[PDB]
Design a protein around this ligand. Structure first.
Ligand SMILES: *[C@@H]1O[C@H](CO)[C@@H](O[C@@H]2O[C@H](CO)[C@@H](O)[C@H](O)[C@H]2NC(C)=O)[C@H](O)[C@H]1NC(C)=O
Lengths: 215, 248, 209
């Protein structure tokens, strides 16, 4: 059995009624008992258990947590949501000998759309003295996580040589930060002059270009 | 006692006053099945079983013939033909200590629906699948005895309701549990109707000089006509004479 | 009643490591001792199950290849030994009570053919022109992690340090940035403090245009 979790991410206002769904590959109920267990895991924390089975709840888990379902369809219910309930929620099955978890259901405190500010960092001259160049593209905080980052060198698109990092959902400003690093050798870096980052985001009415000339 | 082991005490050789029960207003639920609540004081039964426990309020309706549910299916199941009654009274202050009482626990899972008036204490790990449990709690193996959770501030349906189910069994043996017989004041020199402990008659009841033996209850004359009786109270002998009659 | 899990590893590919879990306050006789694999991104999955009462080993078929599970009654511990090591099988390994009401703190088993190497700190120049962002990149450091602060903790507001990213060479990278008013750029001195204890490297680098 392979499970599918929907949605991948879901936004909540503090105290808003919450539901997350899982679909199973096969039937989970046999002899009248379904056998899935769903976990919550805050970052850097051991994931606990919320449910013995389909619906019931383990002792020590607050009664606000609940869940129910049958067959392939299953779903939780986190009716009072607080700052603590900000984590990824997995869903298990126990029927086939390979016990499989699910994907990832990140819980985020919902907020009004925040426009991201874009900045660029050319590689320092001393860094070029080492023999490498690292061009950095930074998003200065933003609520809508999804964004497309494009690297441009002398009006040419790049591919497959940039690594991206995204921070977690911050507790107070509720804005993710994104950093895209293009790493290259000095010889190829010096071959082009204009270096630009294009950011497309569903908080910006237009894409933002942060560019620099070598110098 | 927790519902997974309902405490059953039998009672016999006792005169039971059920009037105080329904007359009391402390009990929230007084659903009695089979026997009329008012007539309870007028029926004699061989013995009475009192099965007592504590339940969640929202599950209090589950304790009755013909309902299904975790408490009904796995903790305490009443028969389809039940002749008794169910006292159910909220005890939020007594049973919900500060911070939540966790001593009371119930059996969520059991392989088979237990028969009426069955008690299962065995804390055996439920198979819940094809896994050999071997006495260890696994993903499919787990302890089916969970504490309710009794924080003092909770929903009214989650509060402790203490429930006692009185079950009356009337076997071939003589009935030992009865209601109060009641009594009335005695009037001496009047043509009246009397029922002295099942002695039904008419007439005038004088105070008599008869010296009954201690065990005797009433006295007949020749031709076997009742002409004396002790009133059960105060143990004093009375003399019965027929109401005046004649021809005119 | 707790649970402890011992040992960060760096052992070369192809070997075997027996990760150990001390049961602590458990009864360690009526509670299955489950093994879990959290892949670094998000992927958790069930390694296997051990019955401490008997020693029954129920293991996943795909990982039945060389992963073995052992129970020690003397110390009440669990030893998971996954023979043969490879780059992809470098994930966090966890031990849990029954279904997982109590887990261990976790171990980061990292199959690495590389070697310990000190971090390189390079200044990310302040923006040309208003709020401007500056900072430091910490690149090519092994093993993880690297602690990066600003002014030895005297600059906290507006500081964003991204989680370490794994590059092609097998060496980690991160960027620590700060956004400040432009008026401070020509006046305020900003220094990034980088500590990598595994290589015992401490670097304090000032950022200037
Ligand atoms: C009814 O109960 C009372 C209490 O024991 C008994 O009557 C008492 O009799 C003595 C002797 O004449 C009096 O001094 C008391 O005042 C009486 N008490 C009351 C409350 O009336 C009597 O034995 C009982 N009736 C029975 C057993 O048939």
């Amino acid at each position: 059995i392979v499970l599918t979790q929907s949605p991948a991410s879901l936004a909540v206002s503090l105290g808003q009624r919450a539901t997350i769904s899982c679909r199973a590959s096969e039937s989970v109920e046999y002899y009248g008992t379904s056998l899935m267990q769903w976990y919550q895991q805050k970052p850097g924390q051991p994931p606990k258990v919320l449910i013995y089975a389909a619906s019931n709840v383990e002792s020590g888990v607050p009664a606000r947590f609940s869940g129910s379902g049958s067959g392939t369809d299953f779903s939780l219910n986190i009716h009072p949501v607080e700052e603590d309930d900000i984590a990824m929620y997995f869903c298990q099955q126990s029927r086939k000998v390979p016990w499989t978890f699910g994907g990832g259901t990140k819980l985020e405190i919902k907020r009004t759309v925040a426009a991201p500010s874009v900045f660029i960092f050319p590689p320092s001259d001393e860094q070029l003295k080492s023999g490498t160049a690292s061009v950095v593209c930074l998003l200065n905080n933003f609520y809508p996580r999804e964004a497309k980052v494009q690297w441009k060198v002398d009006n040419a698109l790049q591919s497959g040589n940039s690594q991206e990092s995204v921070t977690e959902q911050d507790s107070k400003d509720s804005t993710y930060s994104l950093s895209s690093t293009l790493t290259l050798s000095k010889a190829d870096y010096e071959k082009h002059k204009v270096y630009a980052c294009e950011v497309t985001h569903q908080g910006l009415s237009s894409p933002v270009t942060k560019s620099f000339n070598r110098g | 006692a927790s519902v997974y082991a309902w405490n059953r005490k039998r009672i016999s050789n006792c005169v039971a006053d059920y009037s105080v029960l329904y007359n009391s207003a402390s009990f929230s639920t007084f659903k009695c099945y089979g026997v009329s609540p008012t007539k309870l004081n007028d029926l004699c039964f061989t013995n009475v079983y009192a099965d007592s426990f504590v339940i969640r309020g929202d599950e209090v309706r589950q304790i009755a013939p013909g309902q299904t549910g975790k408490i009904a299916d796995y903790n305490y199941k009443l028969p389809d033909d039940f002749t008794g009654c169910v006292i159910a009274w909220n005890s939020n202050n007594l049973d919900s200590k500060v911070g939540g009482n966790y001593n009371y626990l119930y059996r969520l899972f059991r392989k088979s629906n237990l028969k009426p008036f069955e008690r299962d204490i065995s804390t055996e790990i439920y198979q819940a699948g094809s896994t050999p449990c071997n006495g260890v709690e696994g993903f499919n193996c787990y302890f089916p005895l969970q504490s309710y959770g009794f924080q003092p501030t909770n929903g009214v349906g989650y509060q402790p309701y203490r429930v006692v189910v009185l079950s009356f069994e009337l076997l071939h043996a003589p009935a030992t549990v009865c209601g109060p017989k009641k009594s009335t004041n005695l009037v001496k020199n009047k043509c009246v109707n009397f029922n002295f402990n099942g002695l039904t008659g008419t007439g005038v009841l004088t105070e008599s000089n008869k010296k009954f033996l201690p065990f005797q209850q009433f006295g007949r004359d020749i031709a076997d006509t009742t002409d004396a009786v002790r009133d059960p109270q105060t143990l004093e002998i009375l003399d019965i004479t027929p109401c005046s009659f004649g021809g005119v | 009643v707790q649970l402890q899990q011992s040992g960060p590893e760096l052992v070369k590919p192809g070997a075997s490591v027996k990760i150990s879990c001390k049961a602590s306050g458990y009864s360690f006789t009526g509670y299955s001792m489950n093994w879990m694999k959290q892949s670094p991104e998000k992927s958790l999955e069930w390694i296997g199950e051990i019955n401490p009462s008997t020693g029954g080993t129920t293991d996943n078929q795909k990982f039945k290849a060389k992963a073995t599970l052992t129970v020690d009654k003397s110390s009440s511990t669990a030893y998971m030994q996954l023979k043969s090591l490879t780059s992809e099988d470098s994930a966090v390994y966890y031990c849990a009570r029954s279904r997982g009401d109590y887990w261990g703190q976790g171990t980061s088993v990292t199959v690495s053919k590389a070697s310990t190497k000190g971090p390189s700190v390079f200044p990310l120049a302040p923006s040309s022109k208003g709020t401007a962002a500056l900072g430091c990149l910490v690149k090519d450091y092994f093993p993880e992690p690297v602690t990066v602060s600003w002014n030895s903790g005297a600059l906290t507001s507006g500081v964003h340090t991204f989680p370490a990213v794994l590059q092609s060479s097998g060496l980690y990278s991160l960027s620590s940035v700060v956004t400040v008013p432009s008026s401070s750029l020509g006046t305020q001195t900003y220094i990034c403090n980088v500590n990598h204890k595994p290589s015992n490297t401490k670097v304090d680098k000032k950022v200037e245009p």
